[PDB]
């Protein structure tokens, strides 16, 4: 008889909570034959700010959290291989690569203090602004919200003034004119009333401008102290197939979100793969600086980039098998 608490930073009817986390939690409960119940607390209901979620899991405030890796910068630098500009073409492929590389490089190193249940990226990160944006110079003198240190670097290099804040604060920040626009993928715009608060959006054909890494993470003591058969339940509903499903589900939610912006008459600029080269010219120096920072810490940054590309190429849609579990 086991009760676990799950804490996260978006509303219960948001896309990841409802179609990813509730499916995972329901899977663990069904698979445990009712021996595990998971209480789900949305919108930081148990207190704190979203950046604090990783430490809430480590300190046992919550048993399980979904959080943005980038909200605790300087801690988990290996994840940042997926946050390099124009790196990712397919969120399922990247989430597959992210799980393999997590297990190879990160599990017993930068993530040793926590049990990692899932690793994924969102759909293409893109702009949502009070004024139309077609080329990098349009961002000059705009305050743009970012959620990671690599996204703040990207924003600086295209001539934006980056404002770092957790994603739920965007709505108030836009409404009060603290920011002129934000980075996010499409899927989460709906829950944040972004199409209501701004009339312009800039998306990119081909590779994503950026995407942020997430984890689903669990207090080590809470996991280790389960009986071994209940440990095997958590593991059976977690890891590689789960990670591909989390990234795929979240990426797929871009579509219905974009359609809301279209149907209201918001302006959407679609940057062609040709016109993206002007953007790439300003942001691709991050590859060289990031590799140098990793090399300074004795990490082969370029080998991490090469292995990410190789794993994303090796992903095949037949690996996307995650669904509702047997008991
Ligand atoms: O950009 C951020 O600060 C976070 C990104 C994010 C996107 C989609 C769901 C939750 C968080």
């Amino acid at each position: 008889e086991v009760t676990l608490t799950l804490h996260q930073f978006l509303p219960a009817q948001a896309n990841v909570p409802k179609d990813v986390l509730d499916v995972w939690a329901d899977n663990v409960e069904e698979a445990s034959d009712g021996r595990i119940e998971i209480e789900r607390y949305p919108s930081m209901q148990l207190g704190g700010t979203p950046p604090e979620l990783m430490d809430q899991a480590i300190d046992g405030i919550a048993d399980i959290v979904w959080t943005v890796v980038g909200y605790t910068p300087g801690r988990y630098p290996s994840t940042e291989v997926f946050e390099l500009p124009f790196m990712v073409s397919d969120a399922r492929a990247a989430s597959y690569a992210y799980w393999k590389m997590f297990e190879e490089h990160m599990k017993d190193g930068e993530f040793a203090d926590v049990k990692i249940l899932g690793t994924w990226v969102h759909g293409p990160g893109m702009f949502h602004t009070n004024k139309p944006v077609a080329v990098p110079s349009d961002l000059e003198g705009m305050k743009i919200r970012g959620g990671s240190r690599l996204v703040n670097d990207l924003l600086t290099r295209v001539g934006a003034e980056p404002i770092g804040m957790p994603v739920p604060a965007i709505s108030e920040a836009l409404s009060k004119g603290v920011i002129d626009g934000t980075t996010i993928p499409w899927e989460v715009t709906s829950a944040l009333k972004v199409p209501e608060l701004v009339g312009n959006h800039t998306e990119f054909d081909g590779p994503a401008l950026y995407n942020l890494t997430f984890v689903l993470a669990m207090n080590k003591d809470a996991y280790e102290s389960l009986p071994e058969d209940l440990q095997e339940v958590i593991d059976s509903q977690s890891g590689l197939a789960f990670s591909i499903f989390a990234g795929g589900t979240q990426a797929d939610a871009d579509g219905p979100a974009r359609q809301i912006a279209v149907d209201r008459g918001n302006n959407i600029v679609t940057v062609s793969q040709e016109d993206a080269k002007a953007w790439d010219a300003l942001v691709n120096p991050i590859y060289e600086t990031w590799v140098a920072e990793m090399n300074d810490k004795g990490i082969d940054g370029q080998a991490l980039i090469d292995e990410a590309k190789s794993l994303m190429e090796e992903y095949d849609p037949s690996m996307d098998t995650y669904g509702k579990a047997a008991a």
Side-chain angles (χ1 to χ4, degrees):
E1 174 67 345
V2 181
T3 297
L4 300 168
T5 65
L6 185 157
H7 204 197
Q8 58 91 10
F9 55 93
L10 286 186
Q13 86 282 352
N15 293 314
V16 159
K18 91 170 145 63
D19 293 334
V20 178
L21 307 182
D22 277 342
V23 170
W24 178 90
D26 290 358
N27 279 1
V28 164
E29 290 176 355
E30 286 316 315
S32 80
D33 205 8
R35 296 176 53 200
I36 303 174
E37 185 173 11
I38 301 157
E39 293 179 356
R40 310 106 198 252
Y41 299 77
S43 299
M44 301 306 300
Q45 175 174 17
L46 291 181
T49 65
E52 293 184 333
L53 278 160
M54 191 66 80
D55 292 347
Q56 287 185 4
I58 294 159
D59 298 348
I61 295 289
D63 300 308
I64 305 159
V65 303
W66 167 51
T67 194
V68 189
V69 173
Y71 286 7
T72 49
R75 281 155 60 154
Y76 310 118
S78 297
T79 67
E80 291 175 345
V81 69
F82 297 100
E83 306 189 4
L84 294 167
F86 294 116
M87 177 73 171
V88 174
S89 288
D90 178 351
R92 295 180 161 80
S95 298
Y96 166 85
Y98 179 16
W99 184 264
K100 298 289 195 190
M101 286 180 73
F102 160 82
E103 283 213 305
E104 177 63 17
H105 300 296
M106 310 181 202
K107 179 185 179 164
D108 295 325
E110 57 211 278
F111 283 116
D113 290 342
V114 71
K115 167 75 169 160
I116 291 306
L117 294 174
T119 57
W120 71 95
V121 301
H122 60 69
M126 54 163 304
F127 293 102
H128 316 267
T129 51
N130 269 336
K131 283 173 198 204
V133 175
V135 295
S137 70
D138 296 326
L139 286 172
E140 286 174 16
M142 284 191 97
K143 299 187 198 77
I144 308 303
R145 208 290 316 194
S148 86
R149 86 167 182 115
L150 262 74
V151 167
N152 280 8
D153 190 347
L154 187 165
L155 283 173
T156 304
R157 283 178 184 272
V158 299
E161 176 181 350
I163 314 300
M165 74 178 49
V167 83
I170 286 167
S171 313
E172 175 183 14
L174 286 171
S175 182
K176 288 181 176 303
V178 169
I179 65 179
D180 294 303
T182 184
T183 60
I184 29 177
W186 276 122
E187 68 84 355
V188 71
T189 63
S190 319
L192 303 177
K193 293 264 170 178
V194 160
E196 285 87 358
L197 285 168
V198 304
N200 295 274
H201 315 267
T202 313
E203 67 192 8
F204 293 80
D205 289 338
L209 178 70
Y210 78 94
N211 38 222
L212 292 193
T213 51
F214 303 99
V215 292
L216 181 70
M218 188 178 176
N219 173 282
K220 266 185 119 155
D221 295 349
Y223 171 88
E224 278 163 17
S225 93
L226 290 174
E228 192 178 309
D229 58 328
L230 283 190
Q231 289 178 28
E232 273 159 15
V233 169
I234 293 276
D235 300 340
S236 73
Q237 308 308 309
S238 305
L240 174 58
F242 172 57
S243 296
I244 296 166
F245 159 92
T249 303
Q250 193 171 11
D252 287 356
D254 289 349
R258 179 180 192 284
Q259 195 68 65
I260 296 171
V262 176
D263 294 358
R264 287 174 47 88
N266 285 12
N267 301 317
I268 303 166
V269 179
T270 308
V271 179
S272 72
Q273 252 189 290
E274 192 51 31
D275 279 329
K277 300 177 158 148
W279 291 83
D280 188 73
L282 296 165
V283 296
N284 70 36
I286 293 165
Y287 280 78
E288 306 164 54
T289 65
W290 184 82
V291 159
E293 281 180 24
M294 299 302 269
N295 285 345
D296 290 350
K297 287 170 183 189
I299 298 161
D300 196 336
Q302 187 64 52
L304 285 184
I305 292 167
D306 296 342
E307 182 186 11
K309 292 296 207 185
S310 181
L311 285 163
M312 281 184 306
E313 199 58 49
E314 143 191 317
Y315 170 88
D316 171 76
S318 75
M319 301 165 187
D320 186 16
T321 62
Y322 197 80
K324 302 175 68 181

